[PDB]
Design a protein around this ligand. Structure first.
Ligand SMILES: NC(=O)c1ccc[n+]([C@@H]2O[C@H](COP(=O)([O-])OP(=O)(O)OC[C@H]3O[C@@H](n4cnc5c(N)ncnc54)[C@H](O)[C@@H]3O)[C@@H](O)[C@H]2O)c1
Ligand SMILES: NC(=O)c1ccc[n+]([C@@H]2O[C@H](COP(=O)([O-])OP(=O)(O)OC[C@H]3O[C@@H](n4cnc5c(N)ncnc54)[C@H](O)[C@@H]3O)[C@@H](O)[C@H]2O)c1
Ligand SMILES: NC(=O)c1ccc[n+]([C@@H]2O[C@H](COP(=O)([O-])OP(=O)(O)OC[C@H]3O[C@@H](n4cnc5c(N)ncnc54)[C@H](O)[C@@H]3O)[C@@H](O)[C@H]2O)c1
Ligand SMILES: O=C(O)c1cccc(C(=O)O)c1
Ligand SMILES: [Ca+2]
Ligand SMILES: [Ca+2]
Ligand SMILES: [Ca+2]
Ligand code: NA
Ligand code: NA
Lengths: 413, 405, 411
C-alpha cells in the first residue's frame, strides 16, 4: 500500500520548491544529501553465532548548523526511508528555527528479536563504525522508533572512548547521564501544543474533540496522556499487536498503567478490543498517526472520518492522500511542525550539555512553548503570503530558511 | 574504610560484582619528574595521579606536594572524592594526585619547573572533560596557573583544565569564602527541616582559619550568636555573642584570640564541651571520641573539618539526640564552587559574586533535601544517608553506561 | 601612523606609573607571533594574482586573541603591530578575557569581483586555519571586510574543524551573529558617559552636547543621548554641520538622514562652520569622526567641560596637556568606544554557549561591562593620582602584566 517514502517526500519537496520559485541548480543542491553512509554492523549473538546488519546514517544538510536526527531500529529501515527522514529533519529544524541541519540513521533489525545484551553490542558496533562522522558540532543523533534513552547511553559511552567524555554528542540521554528533563515527553507534548495552536484558530479546544491514535510508544503514549489530561476524549488506540476502543473515552492513565504492567491493548478492561486495521478509518474528530509513515495513502484516504489529522509520526500521509483529504475538507497539521517538540528539546539538552550546566525543568518547558508558538505563527503568516495549505506553509518556511543560509555560505572551494 | 563501604553497598543492595568494579580505580599513573635545580644539579621525584571513577563526569581532585606518600591513602582519598562529587550532584568523579617531594627544600623556580615537567608527563591523561586537578596540601593557585600555562601549550588555551586558579587567569569569585559560606547554607537547610533559624541559635567554633572565619562571618551576619571560638593558639568567649566583625579586624592586625577585648579569654580545651546549640569543628579531625562525646552540650554538630567524629562518638551522640551534619556534605562548598569555576570557564563568561553564591546556596540546599529524602528511604542517619546517596548515584550511572565492549 | 604613536606613548607612560620591570616590559612589547602567508588565487578570467596575508598575534596571557581583518593595500608592519598591541590593552581595560591581534590582506578589494573576494577569503583561511581558532585567535571584520567575509571564513574553517561558529565575530545573524551590534559602539559611549556623570551626581539630561561625525557611532550616540533628555546643540559630518541652541530634534534629523538628506540641509538647525564644532559652546563634546582633530592650535578654544572620545585617537598629546590644564575631563577612547569589541565578545560567548541572547540581554550585559570598567578605571585613578586616560591604560597594562607574571617564564 505504501508509496515509496522518498518518492513521496521528494514530491512534497518539489511542490514546496515550485511555490518558492527556486531555480533548478539550487534546488538540485538542496535535494541531494550532503553525505550518505552505509556500514557493516556485525555482532556475536549471546550464543556466539554471528549476525550481520547494515547500518545507515544519512547526513542531508548542514547549512544551518550541526546535523540532527534520530536513529531507528526497525525491520523496514532502508536507504529510501532514511533519506526521506533525513531530508524532513532539515526542513523541520528550520521550521522551529533551531540551529541544526538534518540527518537520520537506523538499522534494519527487529529489537523484539534481540536480547538486551545483543542490542547493546549492536549499538556500540554501530557507534564504532560512525564515530568519525558524527560529533557535538557535526551530527548529533537521538532516539527514534525502536530505540530509547538506554540506547543513547550506549552511544554516549562508546563514542566517548574515541573522543573523550562527550555528553552533547547524543540527545535523549538518561537524566543521570546528562539528559534534559522534559525530553522524554517532548514530542507528544509538542504535538498537543501544536494542536492547541491550530484549534485556537477555529475557536475550538481539545476538550471539544474525539481522538484516535495509531501507535503507542514514546510519541503515542505522551501524546495520548497530554490530550487526555486536557479533557480530550481518546476513543481508539492501536499498536502493532492490537487495538482498543471506547466511544465514551478511554481512561488513558489506566491504559498506561496497564501497558506498564505488560498488558496488551486488546486486553484492557476499560475498552472493547478492536481490529487495528480499523484505526485510521475510525469515527473521530482528530486522527493522530504515531507510528509508521505512508499509512494514509490513495487506498484508504477516502474512508478517513476525521476533520483534522495531526502528524505526530514522520510522513504518515503521502501526496495522493493529501489531495483526497483536501477535497473531503480535512485539515492536516504537518509532521515538520507538529512533531518538532522532540528535536526542539533535544536542542535544549545539547545547549545544557555544552554549557556544562543544566537548566531548571521550568525553563525547558517555557522555551518549548515559546518555540512551538513562534513556529505556528510563522507558518500562519507564510500560508497567507503563499496562499497555501498548512503542509506547504511549513515546508516552504523551512526550505526558504535553508536556502538563505546556503546562499549565504557560498560555493567556492 | 573498607567495612563502611560494604555497609553502604549492602544498604543499597548493590551486586558484589558491581561493588568490586567500583572499588577498582579507572586508572593509576606514576611518572618520573626530573628537573634541574637552580644550581644545575638534578633531582628526581615520582609524580602520580589516581583516577578513581568517571561514570558521572570527568574526574577531579587535588595535587599534593608532600613527601609522605601512602598509595593506599591516595587511593582512598580519590574514592572519597567520587562519593563527594556525587553527594552534591556535580558532574565529576574522583581523583587524587601529587608529587613525592618536600616543597620546603625547593626554590620557587624549582617548584615551577617541577610543576611544568609534571604537567608535561600527564597532559595526555588530564583535560577539561577528562580529569581536572585542583590545589591540595603543598600546592596553591600559583601551582594551578603553571599547570594551565604548560598544559595549554599542548592543547591550546584551556582555562577549565584546573580549578583554584587566580582570578586574573579565570578563577571564580567567591572561592575564598566558598567552604565557610557553604557550611552556613548547609546549616540553614538543616535548620529549616527542624523549623529553626540561625538567628535563634548559639554557636561554638573550633578553628578560625579559611573555614572558621568565613563561617563565623556568615553566621554573625544572619543573627547567629557565636559564643565561643578557638584556634591552635587560644580561645575567646562571650555568652552574649562575640562581635565577629571586630574579632576579624583583630585577627587581621596580627592579634591573637585570647587578647580580644570584646570577650573573655577561654581555655581552648573547653571548646567542644562549651554550652551552645551548635558546635562546628573547623580545625582538626579526630576531636570527638569515646572519652568526651558524653560531654557535648550542643544539639547540632556541623562537621566542617574532615572526620572530626569517630564511630564511638556518633553512637554516643545519637543516644543523646544530637544531629550531626556530616563532613562529606557540610564542607563541600569549596568543591561545588570549583564546579562553577569550570562552568564559567567552559562558557567563556564569568559570573559575578552574587550569582556564584546563589548557585552555591541552590546546590547546597538541594543536596541537603536529597540527603534527607534518602535517609527516610533507608531509615538511616545523615552520615549514611549522604554516603549512600553518592554511592548510588555512581552505581546508577555505571549501570546505565553498561559493560559490553 | 595614528595608532602607532598613541599606543606606544600611552604604553610607556603607563609602564612607568606602574613601575614595571624593564625585562617584563620588553617581553610585553614583543608580539607572541607574527605571520605572513602567500594568498594566490585565479581571477574570474583564470589569470593568477598573489597577495600577502598577515596576522599579528600580540598577546594571549588573558585569553584567546581577538581582532580585525583589513583588506587594504597599504600595510606597514609597524602600524599593524601597534594595532594588535592596542587591542591587548583595550580588551584588558573592559575585563574581556582576550588578548590582541590584527590581520589582513594587502589588496584593494575594489579591484576584485565578489567571487574573487570569496576565493581570496577562503584561501587566506586555508593558510591560517591552523593559527586561529575558537580558543586561540578570533577574527572579525575591519576595513574592507564585512559579515559576508566572516561567513566565508567560517565556512572554509569549518571544513577543517567542523562547525565552529565562535571562530569569527561580526557574522550574519543567520550564522550565529549577535543582535545589538549596530548600536553597540554609540550606545556604549552613552553608557560610559552616564557612569562618568554619576560621579558628579549629574545625568545626560543636565547637559548640552556637540557631536562631530554622524555615521554609525554618531547617529547611535546622538539617538541615545536625545532619548535620555540630552540636548544636542551641534552636529557635523564631512560635508557640513548644523547647530541649534534649543537642541536639534535628533529623531527628525535621523529621519532626514534615512531619507538620504545631507546633514547640512536639515531644516531643524542653523548652518555652522564645521571647524567651530570642536570649539562650540557645549557642556560635552563627542568626537565621533576622525583622529587627530584636537591639537595645540584649537585645544585652547574648547568650551566643553567633558570630552568623550568615541573616535580613534581624536586628541593628540599637546591637546591632552592643554585640556587637562584648562580642567577638561577626557573620557579616553580606549575605553569609551569599547562597546563594539564588547558586543563582539558577547557574540563569541553566545556561540560558545550554543544559544543566542535577545537584544535586551545584550544591552543589559553591555551596560554592566561598561559601568564596571568605568568604576575600575576610576579606582585606578585614585590609586595612581592620574587622569582617566592613564587610569585606563594602567588598568589594562597591569591586568596583562599580572596575568603574564602569574603564568611564569620557565619552559
Ligand atoms: N521519539 C521521538 O522523539 C520522535 C520525534 C519526532 C517524531 N517521531 C516519530 O514518531 C513515530 C513513532 O516513534 P516512537 O519514538 O514513538 O517509536 P517507539 O518505538 O517508541 O514506538 C512505536 C509505536 O508504534 C507502534 N507500531 C509499530 N508498527 C505499527 C503498526 N504497523 N501499526 C500500529 N502501530 C504500530 C509500536 O507498537 C509502538 O507502539 C515515528 O514516525 C518517529 O519517527 C519520534
Ligand atoms: N573539600 C574539603 O574536604 C575541605 C575543604 C576545606 C577544608 N576542609 C577541612 O577543614 C579544615 C580546616 O580548613 P581551613 O582551610 O579553615 O584550615 P586553615 O589552615 O585555614 O585553618 C585551620 C584553623 O584551625 C586552627 N587549629 C589548628 N589546630 C587546632 C587545634 N588543635 N585546636 C584548635 N584550633 C586548631 C588553626 O589555628 C586555624 O585557626 C581542614 O583541615 C579540613 O579538615 C575540607
Ligand atoms: N576602536 C573601536 O573599537 C572603534 C569602534 C567603532 C568606531 N571607531 C572609530 O569611530 C570613528 C567613527 O566610526 P563610525 O563607524 O561612526 O564611522 P562612519 O564611517 O560610520 O562615520 C564617520 C562619520 O564621520 C564623518 N566625518 C568624516 N570626516 C569628517 C571630517 N573631516 N569632519 C567631520 N566629520 C567627518 C562622516 O561624514 C561620518 O558622519 C572612526 O574614527 C572609527 O575608527 C572605533
Ligand atoms: O533529534 C531528535 O531528538 C529526534 C529524535 C527522534 C526523532 C526526531 C524527529 O524529528 O523525527 C528527532
Ligand atoms: Ca572502577
Ligand atoms: Ca610578548
Ligand atoms: Ca611562493
Ligand atoms: Na641557576
Ligand atoms: Na570565470
Amino acid at each position: 500500500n505504501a508509496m515509496n517514502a522518498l518518492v513521496a517526500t521528494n514530491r512534497n519537496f518539489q511542490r514546496a520548491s515550485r511555490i518558492l520559485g527556486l531555480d533548478s541548480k539550487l534546488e538540485k543542491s538542496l535535494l541531494i544529501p550532503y553525505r550518505e553512509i552505509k556500514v557493516e554492523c556485525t555482532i556475536p549473538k549471546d550464543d556466539g553465532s554471528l549476525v550481520s546488519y547494515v547500518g545507515f546514517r544519512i547526513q542531508h544538510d548542514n547549512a544551518r548548523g550541526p546535523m540532527k536526527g534520530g536513529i531507528r531500529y526497525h525491520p523496514e529501515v532502508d536507504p529510501d526511508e532514511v533519506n526521506a527522514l533525513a531530508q524532513l529533519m532539515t526542513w523541520k529544524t528550520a521550521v522551529v528555527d533551531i540551529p541544526y541541519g538534518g540527518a537520520k540513521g537506523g538499522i534494519g533489525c527487529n529489537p523484539k528479536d534481540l536480547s538486551i545484551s545483543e542490542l547493546e553490542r549492536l549499538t556500540r558496533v554501530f557507534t564504532q563504525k560512525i564515530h568519525d562522522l558524527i560529533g557535538i558540532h557535526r551530527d548529533v543523533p537521538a532516539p527514534d522508533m525502536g530505540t530509547n534513552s538506554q540506547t543513547m547511553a550506549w552511544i554516549l559511552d562508546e563514542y566517548s572512548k574515541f573522543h573523550g567524555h562527550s555528553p552533547a554528542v547524543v540527545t535523549g540521554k538518561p537524566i543521570d547521564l546528562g539528559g534534559s528533563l522534559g525530553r522524554e515527553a517532548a514530542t507528544g507534548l509538542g504535538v498537543v501544543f501544536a494542536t492547541e495552536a491550530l484549534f485556537a484558530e477555529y475557536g475550538k479546544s481539545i476538550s471539544d474533540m474525539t481522538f484516535a491514535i495509531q501507535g503507542f510508544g514514546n510519541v503515542g503514549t505522551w501524546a495520548a496522556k497530554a490530550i487526555f489530561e486536557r479533557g480530550g476524549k481518546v476513543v481508539a488506540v492501536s499498536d502493532i499487536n492490537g487495538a482498543i476502543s471506547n466511544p465514551n473515552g478511554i481512561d488513558i492513565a489506566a491504559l498506561l498503567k496497564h501497558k506498564a504492567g505488560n498488558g496488551s491493548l486488546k486486553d484492557f478492561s476499560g475498552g472493547d478490543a478492536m481490529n487495528p486495521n480499523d484505526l485510521l478509518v475510525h469515527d473521530c474528530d482528530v486522527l493522530i498517526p504515531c507510528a509508521l509513515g505512508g499509512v494514509l495513502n490513495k487506498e484508504n484516504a477516502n474512508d478517513v472520518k476525521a476533520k483534522f489529522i495531526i502528524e505526530a509520526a514522520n510522513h504518515p500521509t503521502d501526496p495522493d492522500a493529501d489531495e483526497i483529504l483536501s477535497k473531503k475538507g480535512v485539515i492536516i497539521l504537518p509532521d515538520v511542525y507538529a512533531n518538532a517538540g522532540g528535536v526542539t528539546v533535544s536542542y535544549f539538552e545539547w545547549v545544557q550539555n555544552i554549557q556544562g550546566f543544566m537548566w531548571d525543568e521550568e525553563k525547558v518547558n517555557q522555551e518549548l512553548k515559546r518555540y512551538m508558538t513562534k513556529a505556528f505563527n510563522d507558518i500562519k503568516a507564510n500560508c497567507k503570503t503563499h496562499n497555501c495549505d498548512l503542509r506547504m506553509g511549513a515546508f516552504t518556511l523551512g526550505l526558504n530558511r535553508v536556502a538563505r543560509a546556503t546562499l549565504l555560505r557560498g560555493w567556492e572551494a
